[PDB]
Nucleic acid binder design. Structure first.
Lengths: 322, 325, 255, 323
DNA sequence: GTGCGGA
DNA sequence: AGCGCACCTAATTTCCTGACGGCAATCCGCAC
């Protein structure tokens, strides 16, 4: 009906001012599947010369009200609604309230419940609160972490009018925020937080991604006739070697901090594949693609050339690669 | 002597997969040559073609619908796609990170050791190497492919290659020599005889010249810009680790009613697959009931149920008693 | 020997946590020292006696999971939720909580003191760094594990140090105003988490991870920090983090 | 008994089309010679000639109007345009990305099998190859052409060429041998007798020397400047994949009021043509009402209506019900 | 299996 | 080797488009 609905509201408000507690730290803000009402209310002092920020060295102005279920949430709506907050009225009654209060319920004495509300207390732990070990003096202590709601509200308001880096997290829904049971999370469900990243020249891109990869030639030395065991006998195949190196190495110049080192295990491996235990006379190992124009240190980028043939390649490139 | 599951029990993963990166190559020069693949932006003009109530349909049937998107395609000179990822295999009895009660630790260690005695993790490992050989980690990239080859490297030994189009995606093979040789090493790592194994997988998919590649799509919530956002790993396209792992755990063929639906499903607690919207293992053959019949009321279960329970322990998760206040 | 220094060079971590209730970015320092203490505990069960009493954190590259908008801001991403234990567990769609993830390349400097500090110790560390994680993230590859002697073998990068003087000495009524003003004056500083404070008293509750130890409910504490290159660093002791425990306070400090 | 469509239903595309790249050639030497075509930047001074309120017109009628634009033109030595693109064809029964009820999947598979039994996807495929032969994928580039030639290549066989200025755009031919031999292979790929088919298409358009070429234009969403921006594919001019594919789905001649307007329309859910400003399938012959009259309440529909439903399942889309 | 309660 | 200038300055005006539209689905624990 109408003028008959107001009965249900003030019926429900007085039936649920016993399940609404006072808190600064709530447990369901980490995971909303944690059973019960676990949390803490920190009412201690401020040092202000200590080197660290906590919930007791910042100026937080509004406490928080917490319930277990979204059903028992009408006191939080009640304390937040006048013509000229309801909280400030019930601290110092101005009748402005008392006049309007007593003419619909005849029970404002009971409701004025919202004043000496009990504090939230930590009594147990579950699998949904983060528990870690910390070394204390030869043994360990088990620590269960409860996040701060009052500090999250305070940071998000003070970052809204500032120009330091910030990130907005958009991950909670309306129905998920209600299930937490806290007033300050149902109003701020998408908070603003600090951005704490390393300097901006140390971020990954594709230029840093391709400077850690190395090129290989496209010629199996074991199928190009003119090469025996691993050494070039012909003299005509030389132009093909000089060209391959040029093609694959044209502009990929690299500085020293970016070139694969010349290991000793690799020049041994090559030796084995074809027999020799030591490098035969007049022959010198050579990379088909140079190791300063970007190349690999592998068995698939190595050829043994005669001592004069190595002199031709080591200078013809030098002109083309300046 | 044991009345319930402990108050904090947690298992970690034993098959840890890293992210994947895409490259473009050519098939006749695929052992020597690779180029980067990049994600481009694309905007479209569309029509309003979704189901609407009859009042709105008479007012918005012929309105324009601009939207934002992103895409990835191969070049006009390359015809293949190269994907590289890696797996790390760790033992099962050392993947328990928390257990409040000591007697439950003793009982579960005994049960894993009896499962090492009979079928020492060899069936499941063969199924995992089958899902590496079938190339099921190519979700929409396996459709329309001329040649698919997969190469598996363990340590410094490169094994002979696979022809992934010669395998069916519903039947598990137990006769290939290469699959058995890899599966023995993965089984011995699972059993505790070895302490770690590192696997490196390379796949080559021949699609066509300028055809479309399908990367992994991100979950981002921004109110201003709603569009398709694709995964960039170090500037290049790739796939998430979760998709590759979900491809690898599709080994379950022991659910209650398999003779009608004859396909393998992923290994979950209540048999929940994101394709069919009815759970396949709803009550009697769930994980919790079988694990509270294997440890708490000592019983010998059939070997298929033991296979399912050990598969859940290789997948990992938070497995504890219902939480009271 | 007895004292010594070991370098873990160029470690790649994928999917580490990057959320500490007011900060999205670099993980908290307690995880980076937790990696070292876990390495000590696994090395002391293989009967290689060693004790790590200091960690240095050098940063070479980073990437945050998400994208950057046109206006220059960061939007983060999350994986699709699966099945979470609780009441609504047999449902097909689960709920989305608050999370953030980062990728890092880093190098660690460890101060070890034991009965013998040789290259066999480095091999023992190499056979143990393939089972651990760093900050909830997997390790993909590393370059080398080696012993250093001086400040000329350390590779090029940027270390993270504590700057608490630039916070305690700024203008404001409360500490959060001090942090905001100190970040507006110097634009090379970052906010970091440095440990925990106490909200209760030590005792035994019901529902613990290990039911035979001592418990205390805690809250995280935050501070300031900044970056300094390797070649401009004075000593090898002005970049080493350590554990310190007062009564009610669990901290990590460079001092 | 099946009441309602499933909560998650989505079909994937069975006719994928790549992007297009533009080249410039000469007609007599066209099998041996090709050069790139690039987009230039052109800025213009104009006059204020838009319609204005009477007060503003007395203050802004004789003011300059600088604007930015872009343009593409051929060279002074070339006379022909070459466009290259490719098509991949995939089977219809293996193109359902999501379906959350196993009975609805069985029903869809049975109806597609009956359709394969009656007509093996041959009429629709003949229409798709006629749009390749008509050169309808050259929107403003077909006006003012001397010779248009289109070549189709499957695997390593080049089929005999097409004269695209001899095909009417309102009439579908069914007696050409080349169209039939390509259409049989597309039909066999659509039925399931072959797993994939890749088709590559090259077209030559003679338009003259130094004349204008019209590429595709990019969409701008406010937060960006409102100047004209044209599509660059690998540094050269090109067309979008979505624009080519619309020209190939203009095969619908089965709408309710066709006997008055006798032109083919593109295939859409509510039959919305943008050229003529009328929706042609708003109620009883839409996709949503026809798919709920074939599967949920078994009822044999005319063969014209089936042709439309199977054409929607080659395009794709999200067809999901809420409850 | 139901409806609830708020931003 | 060992160097690689001193002085001054970089114009003014009139403007910078009109239209339409920017998806459907899903992400809630808990008393009773």
């Amino acid at each position: 009906p109408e003028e008959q609905k107001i009965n249900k509201y003030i019926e429900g408000l007085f039936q649920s001012i016993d399940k609404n507690h006072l808190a600064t730290h709530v447990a369901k803000f980490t995971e909303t599947n944690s059973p019960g009402n676990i949390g803490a209310y920190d009412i201690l002092s401020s040092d202000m010369n200590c080197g660290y920020l906590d919930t007791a060295n910042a100026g937080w102005k509004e406490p928080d009200i917490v319930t277990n279920d979204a059903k028992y949430k009408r006191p939080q709506g009640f304390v937040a609604m006048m013509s000229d907050t309801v909280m400030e009225h019930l601290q110092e009654d101005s009748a402005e309230l008392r006049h309007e209060m007593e003419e619909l319920t005849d029970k404002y004495d009971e409701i004025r419940g919202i004043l000496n509300m009990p504090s939230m207390q930590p009594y147990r732990t579950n699998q949904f609160i983060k528990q870690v070990f910390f070394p204390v003096g030869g043994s360990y202590h088990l620590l269960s972490i409860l996040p701060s709601t009052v500090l999250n509200y305070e940071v998000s308001d003070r970052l809204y009018r500032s120009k330091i880096p910030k990130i907005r997290l958009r991950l909670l829904s309306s129905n998920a925020a209600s299930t937490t049971g806290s007033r300050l999370v149902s109003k701020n469900k998408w908070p603003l937080v600090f951005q704490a990243l390393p300097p901006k020249f140390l971020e990954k891109n594709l230029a840093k991604a391709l400077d850690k990869e190395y090129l290989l030639p496209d010629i199996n030395i074991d199928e190009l006739e003119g090469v025996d065991n691993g050494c070039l006998i012909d003299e005509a195949l030389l132009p093909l070697i000089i060209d391959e190196g040029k093609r694959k190495g044209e502009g990929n110049y690299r500085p020293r901090h970016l070139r694969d080192e010349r290991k000793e295990e690799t020049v041994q491996a090559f030796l084995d594949k074809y027999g020799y235990c030591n490098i035969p006379v007049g022959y010198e190992v050579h990379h088909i693609v140079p190791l300063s124009q970007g190349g690999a240190d592998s068995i698939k980028n190595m050829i043994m050339l005669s001592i004069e043939h190595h002199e031709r390649v080591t200078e013809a490139h030098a002109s083309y690669f300046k | 002597t044991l009345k319930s599951r402990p108050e904090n029990l947690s298992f970690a993963r034993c098959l840890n997969t890293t992210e994947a990166k895409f490259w473009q190559t050519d098939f006749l020069k695929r052992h020597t040559f690779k180029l980067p693949l990049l994600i481009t932006d694309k905007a479209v003009l569309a029509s309003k073609g979704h189901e609407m109530p009859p009042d709105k349909l008479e007012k918005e049937i012929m309105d324009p619908n601009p939207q934002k998107s992103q895409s990835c395609t191969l070049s006009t000179e390359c015809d293949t796609l190269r994907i590289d990822f890696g797996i790390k295999v760790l033992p099962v009895k050392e993947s328990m990170y928390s257990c409040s009660d000591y007697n439950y630790r003793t009982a579960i260690y005994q049960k894993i050791d009896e499962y090492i005695a009979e079928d020492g993790f060899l069936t499941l490992a063969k199924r995992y190497v089958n899902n590496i050989a079938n190339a099921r980690f190519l979700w929409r990239n396996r459709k329309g492919a001329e040649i698919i080859e997969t190469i598996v490297t363990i340590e410094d030994k490169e094994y002979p290659s696979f022809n992934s189009k010669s395998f069916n995606l519903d039947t598990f093979v137990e006769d290939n020599a290469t699959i058995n040789e890899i599966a023995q090493q993965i089984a011995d790592t699972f059993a505790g005889k070895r302490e770690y194994l590192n696997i490196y997988v390379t796949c080559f998919v021949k699609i066509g010249c300028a055809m479309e590649v399908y990367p992994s799509q991100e979950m981002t919530f921004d109110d201003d810009d709603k569009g398709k956002k694709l995964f960039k790993f170090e500037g290049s396209a790739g796939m998430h680790s979760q998709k590759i792992n979900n491809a690898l755990r599709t080994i379950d063929t022991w659910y209650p009613d398999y003779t009608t639906y004859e396909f393998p499903i992923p290994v979950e607690n209540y048999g929940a697959a994101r394709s069919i919207g009815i759970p396949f293992r709803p009550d009697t053959k769930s994980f919790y009931k079988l694990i509270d019949r294997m440890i708490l009321k000592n019983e010998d279960l059939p070997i298929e149920d033991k296979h399912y329970v050990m598969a859940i322990l290789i997948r990992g998760g938070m497995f504890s008693k219902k939480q009271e206040k | 020997m007895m004292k010594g220094y070991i370098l873990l060079e160029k470690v790649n971590i994928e999917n580490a946590n990057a959320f500490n209730n007011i900060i999205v970015g670099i993980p908290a320092i307690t995880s980076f020292l937790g990696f070292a203490r876990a390495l000590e505990r696994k090395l002391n069960a293989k009967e290689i006696a060693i004790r790590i009493n200091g960690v240095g954190l050098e940063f070479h590259e980073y990437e945050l999971k998400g994208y950057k908008n046109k206006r220059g801001q960061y939007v983060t991403s999350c994986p699709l939720p699966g099945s979470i234990p609780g009441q609504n567990e047999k449902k097909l769609d689960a709920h989305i909580m608050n999370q953030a993830y980062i990728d890092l390349n880093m190098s660690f400097l460890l101060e070890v003191e034991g009965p013998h500090v040789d290259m066999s110790t480095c091999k023992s560390i190499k056979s143990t760094m393939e089972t651990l994680r760093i900050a909830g993230g997997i390790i993909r590859n590393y370059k080398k594990i080696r012993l250093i002697d001086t400040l000329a073998d350390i590779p090029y990068g940027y270390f993270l140090t504590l700057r608490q003087d630039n916070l305690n000495d700024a203008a404001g009524d409360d500490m959060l105003d001090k942090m905001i003003h100190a970040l507006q004056q110097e634009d090379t500083l970052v906010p970091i988490a440095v440990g925990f404070k106490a909200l209760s008293e030590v005792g035994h509750v019901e529902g613990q991870r290990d039911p035979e130890k001592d418990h205390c409910f805690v809250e995280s504490i935050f501070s300031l920090g900044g970056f300094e290159c390797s070649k401009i660093l004075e000593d090898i002791n002005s970049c080493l983090w350590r554990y310190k425990t007062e009564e009610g306070l669990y901290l990590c400090t460079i001092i």
